Amino acid sequence: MTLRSALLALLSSGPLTGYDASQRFGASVGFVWSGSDSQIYPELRKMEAEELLVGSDVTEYALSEKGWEALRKAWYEPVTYGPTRDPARLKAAYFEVGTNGDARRHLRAHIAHFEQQKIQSESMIDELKAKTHPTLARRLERSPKKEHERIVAFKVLAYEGQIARAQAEIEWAEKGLKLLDTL
Amino acid sequence: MTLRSALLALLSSGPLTGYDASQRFGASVGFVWSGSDSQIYPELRKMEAEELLVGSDVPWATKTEYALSEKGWEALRKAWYEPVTYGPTRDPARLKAAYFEVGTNGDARRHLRAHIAHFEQQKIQSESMIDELKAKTHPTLARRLERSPKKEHERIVAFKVLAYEGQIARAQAEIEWAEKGLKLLDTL
Ligand SMILES: COc1cc(C(=O)[O-])ccc1O
Ligand SMILES: COc1cc(C(=O)[O-])ccc1O
C-alpha cells in the first residue's frame, strides 16, 4: 500500500517505463521508502490492472485520473505509524550477550553508518536546491511555477529529517560508548 | 532471521510457553523489534524443529514450554557477534512530508502535528519503561535477573536502559524536525 503510494508520487513527476521507474525510484523517493526492482515491477503491473495507471507503448506508465485521485486520497489520510523494527536498538538492548569490545564495534559501526547517511542527505539537498536532481527537474518542468518553491522545500524537509534522525543516532551511540567506559 | 534473534534474546530470560512468550515479547523487546502473535508462534515452532529450543509439555490442557538448548545459546551468541545489517529506510512520515505539495499547507500542518503527538507519546512510554527497568520490576527483566549472576545485573539493566534512551533520542529528533517543518509551513 505504501509502496503503491510512493510509486504514485514518483509517477506524478511524469510517465516512466518500469525499468526507468525502478532506476529513478532508487535515486529519489527510495531513500525514504525503499523499493527494489522485484517489488516495483509487479506493483506497477497491479496498478495498471486496477486502472490507476495507463500503459502506452514506447510499457510506459502514466497516472490515470483514478491514479491522481488515489494519490490525493493517500496523502490526505493520516499517517499510520507502524511498530518499531530497529536492528541496532535490538542489538544494543542485549549488548550483555557479547563483550564490551563487541558493543563498541557495534556502536562505532552505527556512527559510521549514520555519518555516511548525513553526507548522502546533504548532497541530495544540494542537488534539490540546484534544481538539477533528474526526477525533481522533470517534476518542476511539469508543475505550475507558483508550486516550485513548495515542491523543492518539501523534498528538502524530508532530507533534513533524515539528517535529524542521523544526528540523534550518532549522539546516542556516542553516549553508549561513554557508558561502556563504566560498565 | 532478526525475529528469531529477538526471540532467542527473550527466551534467555527463561523458558516460556508460546502464549506467555507472545505477551512478554510485546511488553519488552517488541518495543524495539516488533513481533505479532502470528509471527511469533510459527517462528518458535521452527526454532524447536531446528533444535535451537527444547519443547517441554507443561500443565497450563498441556502447552509447550520453550527453553534454549545449547545450540540456541550458541545461535544467540553468534547472532550478537555479527555486525548489524542496516536495512533500507521505509519511513511513512518522511514519505508523506516529501510530497506535502500533493495537499494543502493545512493538511501538512495536520500531519506534522500528528507526528509530534505520536513521538511525544512514545517518549512517555520509553521513559516509563526506563523507570520500570531501573526499579528492576519489569516482568521480563525480573525473570532475567533471577536467572543471572549478581555480578552481571547492573550491566544487564544498563543495556536495556540504553536501548530506550535511544528510542527517546530518536523521538526527540522527530519532534524537533516536525517543529521546524511547522515553522517552514508558516512561510510557504
Ligand atoms: C523523495 O525524494 C525525492 C523525490 C523527488 C521527486 O519526486 O521529485 C526528487 C528527489 C528526491 O530525492
Ligand atoms: C528490550 O526491551 C526489554 C527487554 C527486557 C529483557 O529482555 O529483559 C526487559 C524489558 C524490556 O523493555
Header resolution in angstroms = 1.6
Indicate if the alpha-carbon torsion angle A27, A60, B91, B8 is positive or negative. Answer: negative
Q: Looking at CA atoms only, how far is residue A47 from chain B in angstroms?
A: 19
Same domain, B81 and B95: no
Residue A54, helix vs strand vs coil: strand
Q: How many domains does chain B have?
A: 2
DSSP 8-state secondary structure symbol assigned to residue A55: E
Tell me: do A98 and A65 sit in the same domain: no
- Report strand pairing: A60-63 vs B53-59: unpaired
CB atoms within 10 A of CB B136: 13
Say how many CB pairs under 8 Å bridge A and B.
Answer: 196
Residues A118 and A64 both lie in one domain: no
B79 with B91, same domain: the answer is no
> Does A1 touch chain B if contact means CB atoms closer than 8 Å?
no
Of A85, A109, A183, the CB nearest to B33: A85
Is-contact A32 B94, C-beta < 8 A? yes
Give the domain range for residue A60.
1-81
On whether both A182 and A105 belong to a single domain, the answer is yes
Residue A52 DSSP label: S
Residue in B99, B181, B188 closest to A9 by CB = B99
Helix (H, G, I), strand (E, B) or coil at A82: coil
Q: Of the candidates B165, B10, B140, which has an alpha carbon nearest to the alpha carbon of residue A97?
A: B10
Per the CB < 8 A criterion, the answer to whether B33 and A84 are in contact is yes
Using the structure block, give the residue that is written with the C-alpha cell 508550486: A147
- 3-state secondary structure at position A114: helix
Q: Which of A113, A26, A21, A119 is nearest to A63 (CA)?
A: A21
What DSSP state is assigned to residue A85?
B
- Contact by Cβ (8 Å): A163, A122: yes
- What is d(CA B165, CA B187) in angstroms, rounded to the nearest whole number? 34
* Cell of residue A112, nine digits: 559510521
Instruction: Name the B residues in 36-95 with CB < 8 Å from any A CB.
Output: 76-77, 80-81, 83-95
Among B92, B107, B158, select the one facing A82 at the smallest CB separation. B92
* B139 contacts: CB under 8 Å, gap ≥ 6: B24, B27
Cβ atoms of residues B159 and A96 within 8 Å:
yes
B77 and B128 within one domain: no
Residues B150 and B171 in one domain: yes
Q: Could you tell me if A154 and A183 lie in one domain?
A: yes
Q: Which atom of ligand 2 is nearest to the CA of A90?
A: 1
Q: Please tell me which residue of chain A has the smallest CA distance to B107.
A: A76
Cβ A160 vs Cβ B176: under 8 Å? no
- The residue contributing the CA closest to ligand 2 atom 3 is B28
Residue A91 and residue A171 share a domain = yes
For residue B88, give how far its alpha carbon lies from the nearest alpha carbon of chain A (Å).
6
- Cβ A177 vs Cβ A107: under 8 Å: yes
AA letter at A35: G
Q: How far is the CA of A123 from the centre of ligand 1 (A)?
A: 13
Angle, helix A18-26 to helix A2-11, in steps of 10 degrees: 100
Does an H or E element contain A56, and which?
strand A53-56
Grid cell digits, residue A129: 536546491
In short, whether A133's Cβ falls inside 6 Å of ligand 1 is: yes
**Which of A66, A81, A96 corresponds to the end of one domain?**
A81
Q: What angle, 0 to 180 degrees and rounded to 10, lies between the N-to-C axes of helices B2-11 and B70-81?
A: 120
- Reduced to 3 states (helix: H, G, I; strand: E, B; else coil), residue A32 is coil
Selection from B78, B34, B14 nearest residue A85 by Cα: B34
Compute the distance between CA of residue B83 and CA of residue B80 in angstroms, rounded to an integer.
8
**Sequence letter at residue B116:** I
Q: Which of A81, A114, A132 is the last residue of a domain?
A: A81
CA dihedral angle for residue B50, residue B53, residue B58, residue B62, rounded to 10 degrees: -30
Q: B38 and B98 share a domain? A: no
Contact A96/B at CB under 8 A:
yes
What type of residue sits at position A91? K
Inter-helix orientation angle B153-187/A148-182, to 10°: 160
Q: How remote is the C-alpha of B146 from its chain's centroid?
A: 22
The three-state (H, E, C) secondary structure of chain B, written as one string: CHHHHHHHHHHCCCCEEHHHHHHHHHCCHHHCECCCHHHHHHHHHHHHHCCCEEEEEEECCEEEEEEECHHHHHHHHHHHHCCCCCCCCECHHHHHHHCHHHCCHHHHHHHHHHHHHHHHHHHHHHHHHHHHHHHCCCHHHHHHHHCCCHHHHHHHHHHHHHHHHHHHHHHHHHHHHHHHHHHHHHHC
3-state class (DSSP) for residue A16: strand
Q: For testing the chain B interface, which of A1, A63, A86 should be mutated: the one with the most B CBs within 10 Å?
A: A86
Q: Do A14 and A1 have their domain in common?
A: yes
**Taking CA B31 as the corner, what is the angle to CA B29 and CA B36, rounded to the nearest 5 degrees?**
80
Q: Candidates A8, A71, A152, A155: which one to mutate for ligand 1, based on the most atoms within 8 Å of Cβ? A: A155
If one residue of A2, A34, A133 were mutated to test the ligand 1 pocket, choosing by the most ligand atoms within 8 A of its CB, it would be A133
If you measure from the C-alpha of residue B161 to the centroid of ligand 2, how many angstroms do you get, rounded to a whole number? Answer: 9
Helix (H) or strand (E) holding A173: helix A148-182
CB B28 within 8 A of CB B11: no
Q: At what angle do helices B37-49 and B18-26 cross, to 10 degrees?
A: 130
* Subunit contact A102:B81, Cβ cutoff 8 A: yes
With contacts defined as CB-CB under 8 Å, which chain B residues touch A85?
Answer: 2, 33-34
> What is residue A62's three-state secondary structure?
strand
**Do residues B55 and B135 share a domain?**
no
The reply to whether ligand 1 has any atom less than 6 angstroms from the CB of A8 is no
How many angstroms separate the CA of residue A17 from the nearest CA in chain B?
Answer: 21
Q: Radius of gyration (Cα) for chain A, nearest Å?
A: 20
Chain A residues inside the 8 Å CB shell of B40: none
Backbone angles phi, psi at A101, to 5 degrees: -60, -40
> Residue A59: helix, strand or coil by DSSP?
coil
Q: Which of A81, A100, A119 is the C-terminal boundary of a domain?
A: A81
Question: Across-strand partners of B33?
Answer: A85
Burial of B86 from C-beta contacts in 10 A (0-12 / 13-18 / 19+): middle
Residues recorded for chain A? 183
